[PDB]
């Protein structure tokens, strides 16, 4: 069992959880390669049953009555047709474990506040648009946004998978140029084209909402504008230097991820949306100052006189941080939940102390949970932490193109 | 089995093939990773066999005359004796691959450029001390640092080691109160504790420079004080923050570390201290904002008049870096080589895609490399990295007690 220690306090943890670490990670003992960003009945009968003692534990209702008859069920069903039906209470058990258990998640104090939507009886490209605006618009909640997930049909033999194409359900397009660079966010440059190439009449706006590419099974992927009025965003100003405005940026409220693979007792939902809220260095250190994103560092130093010409002025690191305030200042502002990097990582702090009694450890990733300004001012830089894979779990999956 | 390596900056892929020649086992299994954690007879011909083929490679003499003629004396040597000598260009060789295989080193665009005293003659804590002095002096270079190690008496079965007790060569000191708390260095409160169990005078200051713990074999340590003006220390300011030098801050000139293990070839030199020059994240947000450090971060954003009762204002992220801008003006005012974290990324970089051509690749620990202020600011944060143990290489070793 691992040991843990917390260098700031002298905390001494052992990491139990770790041992039950169903799936396989990328590293060996030649070679640690956790920096990098991506790494049959009876083994679906393993799944689901590891699964569904998972579930009567939570239910405190172990090796009873009712857990034998749930195994023998899904078995019998497994037997008959491939696979098998999780029950709604299953489904939300399993949708707030998989939040639970995601390694990379810093927000996970939240995790068993989590609205389930069940879209299992979804049948259509146009049944799950409505789905998702109605997602779209219980999570953002006027500002005040709530956690959620919709489960679309799970991935069964013989049909199609659902899938939404876009990587989140509100992302804004980036238009290759006419010299070569950007326009808009540059991570979406291939959904944008995919939009257009699907007929989507283009903008010319750096902050262009993308519409939604849903695919139902076996099918082309269909056209979905998103109506403006669901999607909440927020301009961007700063408190106290005025010309910030006038840079034009906005952010959305709602982050959303749509192209994950939630896996839940060996079954595969490949459409299962789920939002929270943002917490601010994604959007002012990543989403605007990552040079191959929006990329305004250097803009944003040049306008408050720092002198760039050298790195020892720290211009970068001075410039960063208004972006952040102007970011937490702007969501505040208008009303819009957000989190900053120093509540977030002292929330997971508590997280993880509440997952070491609760289950004797916690999957966490370093890199991802030490936020990308500040980190060591953060209290989960001088903790070290034991990533590993448990189920259920969201998943990255190909792009369905 | 050649792991893909990623820049997600530029887009750019490379495989480390070196990968392949790790020996030691890291921590890491399929199971979890354990990447965050700090510190997770004729053996020796494997080992010297191996260094020497590294050497004679290196100068483009492998399979040639002196290649041969090396390893039968090293053999010879073993066999009549047990363990061997490295000749003196073996042991450059050697001390300058143990610093190029450093995975958690930012500053090895340096490599090349190493200076390695031969201590290997050393006997008693008084020669000792006039080595350790003769390297700071050189070293230190009245501020113009220069990499240096000075290679005291490897390790022998049947008799005692040579050790350094302190972990660096400049420590400052650490006293407990009449409430636990520590004025000074809390880092330092255990080698405080010891210098003063065995005859030293404790100061009363935060800044108190400690004296050096030397350990010839099979003795007891003698305590020895630092000749106060070879130890060239840089009171901190900031360039427009004028009350920032009446904090009475100051750091000192050369990192020295003292305590490390340095093997080559299956020899082990538990008494090798190496020193560079200092990352100014390494003073200005590690040892100054530290909450088990000097803790300094409040006390400045008091002086900046910030807002220190809501996370949101960023106020730590702010004094943070006005700390850093203290710590790289008053070196460079003090003509103190130092790096800023930008510079010192950037380096390694190219260090990066030098070591892609010499090496095929280069063992590299992210959360060590990414700078613990303004991470995702600096390149490195974005380049997906592969960690691995090399020979020769800087080990930990157990404290001397
Ligand atoms: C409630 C507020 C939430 C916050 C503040 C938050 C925070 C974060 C952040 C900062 C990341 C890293 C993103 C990046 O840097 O690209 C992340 C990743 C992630 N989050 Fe959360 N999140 C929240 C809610 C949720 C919810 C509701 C779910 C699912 C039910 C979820 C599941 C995930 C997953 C799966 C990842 C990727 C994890 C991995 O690959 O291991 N999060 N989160
Ligand atoms: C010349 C300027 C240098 C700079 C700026 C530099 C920078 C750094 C930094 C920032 C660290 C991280 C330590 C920490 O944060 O606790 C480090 C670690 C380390 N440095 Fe360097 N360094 C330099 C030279 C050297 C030299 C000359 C040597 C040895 C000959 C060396 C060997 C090491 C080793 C062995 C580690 C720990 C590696 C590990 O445990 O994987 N460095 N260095
Ligand atoms: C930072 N923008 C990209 C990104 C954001 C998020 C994310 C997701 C949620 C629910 C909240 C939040 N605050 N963030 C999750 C991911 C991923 F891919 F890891 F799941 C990626
Ligand atoms: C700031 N932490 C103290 C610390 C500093 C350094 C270090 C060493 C050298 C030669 C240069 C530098 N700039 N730094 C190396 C280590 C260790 F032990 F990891 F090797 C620890
Ligand atoms: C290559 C490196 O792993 C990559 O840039 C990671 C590092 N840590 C991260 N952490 C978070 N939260 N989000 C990210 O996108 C990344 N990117
Ligand atoms: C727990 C965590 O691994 C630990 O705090 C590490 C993280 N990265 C680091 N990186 C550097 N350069 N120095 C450090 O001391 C640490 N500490
Ligand atoms: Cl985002
Ligand atoms: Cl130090
Ligand atoms: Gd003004
Ligand atoms: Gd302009
Ligand atoms: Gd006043
Ligand atoms: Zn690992």
Redesign the interface.
């Known amino acids: 069992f691992?040991r843990?220690?917390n260098?700031?306090?002298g905390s001494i943890t052992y990491?139990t959880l770790?041992?039950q670490?169903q799936q396989?990670?990328?590293?060996?003992?030649?070679?640690?390669?956790?920096?990098?960003?991506f790494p049959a009945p009876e083994q679906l009968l393993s799944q689901a049953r590891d699964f569904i003692n998972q579930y009567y534990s939570s239910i405190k209702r172990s090796g009873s009555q009712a857990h034998e008859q749930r195994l023998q069920e899904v078995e019998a069903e497994v037997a008959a047709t491939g696979t098998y039906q999780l029950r709604e209470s299953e489904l939300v058990f399993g949708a707030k474990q998989a939040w639970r258990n995601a390694p990379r998640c810093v927000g996970r104090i939240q995790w068993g506040k989590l609205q389930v939507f069940d879209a299992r009886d979804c049948r259509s490209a146009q049944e799950m648009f409505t789905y998702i605006c109605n997602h779209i618009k219980y999570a953002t909640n006027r500002g005040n946004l709530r956690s959620a997930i919709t489960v679309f049909p799970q991935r069964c033999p013989g049909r199609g998978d659902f899938r939404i194409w876009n990587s989140q359900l509100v992302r804004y397009a980036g238009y290759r140029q006419q010299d070569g660079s950007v326009r808009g966010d540059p991570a979406n440059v291939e959904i944008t084209e995919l939009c257009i190439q699907h007929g989507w009449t283009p903008g010319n706006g750096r902050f262009d909402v993308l519409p939604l590419l849903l695919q139902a099974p076996d099918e082309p992927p269909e056209l979905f504008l998103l109506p403006p009025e669901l999607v909440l965003e927020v301009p961007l100003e700063h408190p106290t230097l005025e010309w910030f405005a006038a840079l034009g940026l906005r952010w959305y409220a709602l982050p959303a991820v749509s192209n994950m693979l939630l896996e839940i007792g060996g079954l595969e939902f490949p459409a299962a949306p789920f939002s929270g809220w943002y917490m601010?260095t994604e959007i002012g250190?990543?989403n605007l100052?990552?040079?191959?994103r929006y990329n305004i560092?250097e803009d944003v130093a040049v306008c408050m006189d720092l002198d760039t010409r050298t790195?020892?002025?720290?211009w970068?690191?001075?410039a960063?941080?208004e972006i952040?305030?102007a970011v937490?200042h702007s969501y505040?502002l208008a009303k819009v939940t957000i989190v900053?990097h120093?509540?977030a990582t002292?929330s997971f702090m508590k997280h993880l102390e509440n997952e070491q009694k609760a289950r004797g450890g916690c999957p966490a990733?370093?890199?991802w949970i030490?936020?990308?300004?500040?980190?060591?001012?953060t209290?989960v830089?001088?903790q070290?932490?034991?990533?590993?894979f448990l189920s259920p779990a969201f998943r990255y999956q190909p792009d369905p193109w």
């Open positions: 691992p843990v220690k260098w700031e306090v990491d770790s041992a670490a396989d990670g990328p590293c060996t003992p030649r070679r640690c390669l956790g920096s990098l960003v601010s250190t990543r100052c990552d040079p191959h560092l790195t020892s002025s720290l970068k690191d001075k960063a941080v952040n305030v937490l505040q900053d120093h509540a002292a990733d370093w890199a030490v936020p990308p300004i500040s980190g060591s001012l209290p830089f001088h070290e932490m034991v990533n590993y």
